[PDB]
UniProtKB/Swiss-Prot annotation, chain A:
<dbReference type="InterPro" id="IPR001351">
    <property type="entry name" value="Ribosomal_uS3_C"/>
</dbReference>
<dbReference type="InterPro" id="IPR036419">
    <property type="entry name" value="Ribosomal_S3_C_sf"/>
</dbReference>
<dbReference type="InterPro" id="IPR004087">
    <property type="entry name" value="KH_dom"/>
</dbReference>
<dbReference type="GO" id="GO:0019843">
    <property type="term" value="F:rRNA binding"/>
</dbReference>
<comment type="function">
    <text>Binds the lower part of the 30S subunit head. Binds mRNA in the 70S ribosome, positioning it for translation.</text>
</comment>
<comment type="function">
    <text>Plays a role in mRNA unwinding by the ribosome, possibly by forming part of a processivity clamp.</text>
</comment>
<dbReference type="InterPro" id="IPR015946">
    <property type="entry name" value="KH_dom-like_a/b"/>
</dbReference>
<dbReference type="InterPro" id="IPR009019">
    <property type="entry name" value="KH_sf_prok-type"/>
</dbReference>
<dbReference type="InterPro" id="IPR018280">
    <property type="entry name" value="Ribosomal_uS3_CS"/>
</dbReference>
From Swiss-Prot, chain B:
<protein>
    <recommendedName>
        <fullName>Small ribosomal subunit protein uS2</fullName>
    </recommendedName>
</protein>
<comment type="similarity">
    <text>Belongs to the universal ribosomal protein uS2 family.</text>
</comment>
<comment type="subunit">
    <text>Part of the 30S ribosomal subunit, contacts bS1. Some nascent polypeptide chains are able to cross-link to this protein in situ. In collided ribosomes contacts ribosome rescue factor SmrB.</text>
</comment>
<comment type="function">
    <text>Required for ribosomal protein bS1 (rpsA) to bind to the 30S subunit.</text>
</comment>
Amino acid sequence: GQKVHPNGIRLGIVKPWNSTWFANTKEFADNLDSDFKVRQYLTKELAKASVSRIVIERPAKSIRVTIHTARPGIVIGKKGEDVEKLRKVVADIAGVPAQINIAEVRKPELDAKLVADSITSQLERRVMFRRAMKRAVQNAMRLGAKGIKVEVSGRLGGAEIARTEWYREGRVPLHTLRADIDYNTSEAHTTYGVIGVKVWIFKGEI
Amino acid sequence: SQDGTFDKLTKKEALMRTRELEKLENSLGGIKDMGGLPDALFVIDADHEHIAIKEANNLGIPVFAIVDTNSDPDGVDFVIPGNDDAIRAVTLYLGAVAATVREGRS
RNA sequence: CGUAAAGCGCACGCAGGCGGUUUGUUAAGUCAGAUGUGAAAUCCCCGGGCUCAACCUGGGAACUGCAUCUGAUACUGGCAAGCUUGAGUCUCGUAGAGGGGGGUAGAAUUCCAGGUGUAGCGGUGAAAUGCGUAGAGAUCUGGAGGAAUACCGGUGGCGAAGGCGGCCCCCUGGACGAAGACUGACGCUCAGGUGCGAAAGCGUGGGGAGCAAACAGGAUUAGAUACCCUGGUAGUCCACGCCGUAAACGAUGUCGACUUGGAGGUUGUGCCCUUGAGGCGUGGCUUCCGGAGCUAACGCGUUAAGUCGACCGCCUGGGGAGUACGGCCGCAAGGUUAAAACUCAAAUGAAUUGACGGGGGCCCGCACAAGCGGUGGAGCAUGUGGUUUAAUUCGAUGCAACGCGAAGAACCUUACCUGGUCUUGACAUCCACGGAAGUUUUCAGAGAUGAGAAUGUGCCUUCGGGAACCGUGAGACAGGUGCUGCAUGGCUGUCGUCAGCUCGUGUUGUGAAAUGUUGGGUUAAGUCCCGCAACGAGCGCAACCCUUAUCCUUUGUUGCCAGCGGUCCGGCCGGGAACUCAAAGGAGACUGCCAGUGAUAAACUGGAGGAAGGUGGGGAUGACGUCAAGUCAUCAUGGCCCUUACGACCAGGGCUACACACGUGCUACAAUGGCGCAUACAAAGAGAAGCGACCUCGCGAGAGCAAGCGGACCUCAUAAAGUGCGUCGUAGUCCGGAUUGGAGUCUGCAACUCGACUCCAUGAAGUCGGAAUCGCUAGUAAUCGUGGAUCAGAAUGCCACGGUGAAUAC
């Protein structure tokens, strides 16, 4: 087990943080756990909506949750009853007056959360993994994407030993720190157990 | 190189890139404006340039070689028994060939 | 049939097989036709009958043969006659370690006799056995004897093969060349047969210098029936006889023919100014490399393993087994011919990728070396193994487990043990009923269960209820730190921050695969240049990131005080924004410049400037994969399992046990020090259920009152080694502090098991640590303190911070 998380080593360099509140030591743990609850809830209740990121920020006793998603229409719905329902329950969880926004992730096959969730969904619909991976690499390289690597792992095809079998195309410069590597990871709970899907997407060199 | 951003951003990398133009210019010199693979091949020594003859035979290209007494008529379609390493002989020789090439229908 | 099984060890040769060329005859083989026969059934073909089919059946074909007769005469054979291109004879020379017999010569070893001379010689990795003051070894002279024949000496020669090496003579075999003559197919191969056949061995008789199986002694070693040493018999040498084999090998039968080349060697010879170290040809034998072709590949390649012909020998999976039995041979040893039962599903060849080597070349790293300080010895701390236990919870176990998970076990944590208890449950979701919940009480017991008093309406409901919370009942379930890391994910260690790991297209190979990626340099680096059947590309290296080292700009509080004014002499105040500093933004270092060396290339060496010089220092960053490495006990998770229990609640205990063993640390053994007094210089941090001044009390740990500070402002908080004085004086001591008794402080419901600290008293072991072993290459090791996380309290651990500050690298 030996590679650094390629989001974490780029946190001040190119990648931003998904939480951008300041807090002193008295409420740092409380704000942090409140963020675990709103991302847990808001991740479970938008499983069909293809959600990429949820960014929390707290401007002066009020949360401001931004849902980067690929299907904004299914998040908002017929006149946005679903949004006001979500800020009602996020205001229930965080205990502050909640705002909520939706940012449309166009080009959803270049986002690693959406790619890993895609391949994970296909693996738990019992399709063969080489199609899922290989289709994901092809259609991601089709639109921009100066590199992509996907990597499934663990008891693939229902075996009794676990393999990995990664694929990559293009250039994925993972030790370069100015590389805009969009990396994310999902787990596929199949009837044989968990299958881990990692995906790195190299977008640009700065 | 000669028009765009050559002085841009570095001196060392610019020197690196210019000597990439010397290497790619002397290796891929004449062929750089071809745009196809050619309809004939005219080699000046058959044993010294056996690789090119072997490929033009591999692809069905007519090979026109001036062989010497050490060379081998491999797949040279139009062999010419001559002298490969005399500059008088190859300037006379290429003079005749370049003379007959530049008569098309005109 | 070179290497997989398979070419007799080599020849001579009988029976056998095969046989150049021309003409004539025959017509045996061969061919054509005819006749007789080749029983019928069956097979085959075309038809017919059973409803069809099987079946039955008509006619034909067939029965591939044999015999006889008639022909054909190309090939083969017979016969007769020839012919020269095959084979052989003669003439003349050439080269040769071909053979057998005889003689001789020179070096050297050993022995014997003698002279000189004196303390070792010999031997080995080191030694010892051995030889030597009875005179060795060394050295000189004389003699004897045996074997072998340096230099020439050469992938040189000769021989059928085994094999043959001084020189000379005698007897003798073959080969090759030149011109000519002669015979005229006399040829090729060869089962049985016969001959020759290294070495060792055997027999008889000699010889015996060296060497040397056996043997003996000395070593080496765990052993050493060996390798090494010192001796040493058969044997090796000669004559005659036997044996009859070898990796008897070009692992390649003999003879003949044809099929591109190059460089040699050796031995003949002809021609032509030889006018060199000439030129040009033609034979014989031989060596190396290679073309087509062949070959599984490796390789062979006009001396074939190519393309053919003749004859012979041999092979048929590995083992058993070239063995047993029998025969023949042999003096014997044994040789030759040559099975079977049983057993295995492989054995084998060549080549590829890797790994490995006590193979080779080049290169690196505190790897060794050069040093400095440790560990192993002592006491204690902490972890582990073991033992104990009611339990001593579980996990981690070469490196890469063993102050590791655990950044902190009194209760809690806790998973364990002993008891007491609960069963839709401590934690969920959904029901139905009742009641707002909540708040202070008492009794029993270890807590929760039970018994009472107030408060209950927090807002809506054609009232059948809903919001929140608590009991009660059935459930579907909940729960599991239970098992499986060898079913998994995620996360981690490690080889290793080692420089590598690959891919596309192309080409090469039947193919596994190869190339690229190797080669000449260079580099920290598959770094970079150059070359190259490769051309490119990816992951990795480098750079981008953080920090540190210098300067500039901005802002200047709480931070700073150079110049000012007075000053309670303290940045203390007014004030100043220069400086330290703070933090943001820039500059800077890139082999950029110079000289030299280098493929004029990469680069290397040296120099200047500069705060810094050549990835400046440090960190982060850890390629493809390896260990079915670690974790199911952080979490998630497939399957299995318990579900009045392997779930849950409680009190007490344990995880702290102790004949022992190991790991990692701390403190020591002192004078480069101990103690007392005075005194100087830090950096980095933390802080509200917190850090907690000042002042008073206590010897002290601390206590009381209590400012200031959510913090460059206040507090933790005095840095200590250092320095200057005095004392101690080489003592188990004024070293060392373990252990133990007493008295306490704090935290916490609670310090008995089982805290931390203080005071008084006690004052072990230990005097520099056996075999062995570890860390470190420069602000490093060493040594000195300080802070933090976890935490109510508990670090000698961990993570950080600064002070002093080395040695050494051939």
